[PDB]
Design a protein around this ligand. Structure first.
Ligand SMILES: *[C@@H]1O[C@H](CO)[C@@H](O)[C@H](O)[C@H]1NC(C)=O
Ligand SMILES: *[C@H]1O[C@H](CO)[C@@H](O)[C@H](O)[C@@H]1O
Ligand SMILES: *[C@H]1O[C@H](CO)[C@@H](O)[C@H](O)[C@@H]1O
Length: 379
């Protein structure tokens, strides 16, 4: 891919950054080009809003034990300077004999808030232990920072991603966990839905990503939410979110008032999942979630899957009429379709892209935000 850009000093675009053009002005043309564009997007997101995602450390070990239907995966991670941390997620297993290749698994941030089908194991990930997230007071606290240092630039969500990567490393080394590491999904609701999106985007071994009501800093776009808040919708936005918690790097503070200068938005974050599968779910009852911004953000991200000829690997379903993080039974068929196809190997059709258009004081106008023509990427 060559030397990937992590900063674009002269960038200034009030509309959504174009997925299909590299920072240097080179247009994407092949499906393989998307791998390099994803890597550039990774670098840009880390530089502007997420902080640094460390690579696998040189020590990662794991032991496993099981009591009844609950496994405990005891992980240790260590740096070359001997510093180490440990954490022990648990796994809830279906009973009986697993498939020949092991159970498909969903890594659920603090248990998630989706119903998980019977043939799928659930790993409960205590992401708040990995990086605290009470308020701005939490900056640099959590197991991640006991390894890398409390001034490490990673946001809380980037630290969470790191923990997921170590979990998957551990599973690959632990046959007795009886997990099919080729069929791992990730989910989370609300602030943990923001986290699940980051995990699926940055950790390519995740086969299915399921963010639930993730809102601002999740599947909503910064630029669209600024439009909402300026027009009287009481949405969460970039300016408020960096003061509320530590889900983003301290450096993001330098850009929340200057969003057009940021050469990325969360449509590119979501597009990092491609060519893997993702369906996110949103709720128009809570303007805090920035409903129009999520629909426009994911509509923009969808063009990447469309350009790759795999539109049905990316879903979006947005409805109203239920409490925050309550699962409406009306969406269970859509959720199960993605789980069935991408984790359970069924021939389920996954064409899901729906909203009720309940956006409050604004509307979605694609011509005001998307300026690119989706190319047909070759090869
Ligand atoms: C532009 O940047 C991309 C990503 O680093 C790279 O693959 C491509 O070769 C660059 N274009 C030129 C002409 O070097
Ligand atoms: C982001 O990272 C790139 C390398 O990918 C640097 O060149 C840049 O200065 C910034 O540190
Ligand atoms: C990209 O990022 C660098 C810092 O890494 C800035 O100096 C530059 O102006 C652009 O924001």
């Amino acid at each position: 891919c060559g030397a990937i850009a992590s900063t674009v000093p002269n960038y200034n675009n009030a509309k959504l950054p174009d997925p299909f053009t590299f920072a240097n002005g080179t247009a994407l043309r092949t499906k393989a080009d998307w791998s390099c564009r994803r890597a550039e997007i990774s670098a840009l997101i880390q530089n502007y809003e997420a902080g640094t995602l460390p690579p696998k450390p040189p020590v990662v070990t794991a032991s496993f034990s099981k009591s009844g239907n609950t496994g405990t995966l005891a992980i240790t991670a260590g740096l070359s300077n001997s510093q180490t941390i440990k954490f022990s997620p648990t796994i809830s297993y279906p009973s009986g004999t697993p498939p020949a290749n092991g159970w498909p698994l969903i890594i659920a941030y603090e248990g998630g808030s989706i119903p998980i089908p019977a043939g799928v194991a659930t790993l409960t990930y205590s992401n708040s232990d990995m990086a605290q997230q009470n308020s701005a007071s939490s900056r640099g606290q959590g197991l991640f920072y006991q390894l890398y240092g409390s001034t490490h630039s990673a946001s809380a969500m980037t630290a969470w991603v790191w923990g997921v990567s170590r979990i998957i490393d551990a599973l690959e080394m632990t046959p007795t966990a009886q997990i099919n590491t080729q069929r791992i999904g990730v989910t989370g609701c609300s602030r943990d839905g923001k986290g699940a999106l980051m995990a699926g985007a940055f950790e390519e071994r995740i086969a299915l990503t399921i963010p639930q009501e993730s809102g601002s800093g999740g599947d909503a776009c910064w630029r669209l939410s600024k439009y909402e808040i300026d027009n009287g919708n009481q949405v969460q936005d970039a300016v408020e979110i960096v003061g509320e918690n530590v889900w983003f790097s301290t450096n993001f503070n330098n850009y929340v008032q200057k969003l057009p200068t940021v050469p990325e938005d969360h449509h590119l974050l979501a597009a990092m999942v491609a060519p893997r599968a993702m369906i996110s779910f949103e709720n128009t009852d809570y303007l805090w979630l920035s409903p129009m911004s999520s629909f426009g953000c994911m509509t923009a991200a969808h063009t990447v899957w469309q350009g790759l000829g795999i539109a049905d690997s990316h879903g979006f379903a947005q409805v109203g009429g239920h409490a925050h993080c309550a699962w409406p039974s009306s969406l269970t068929p859509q959720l199960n379709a993605f789980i069935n196809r991408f984790l359970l190997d069924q021939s389920a059709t996954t064409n899901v892209f729906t909203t009720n258009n309940q956006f409050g004081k604004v509307q979605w106008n694609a011509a005001n935000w998307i300026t690119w023509t989706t190319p047909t990427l070759t090869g």
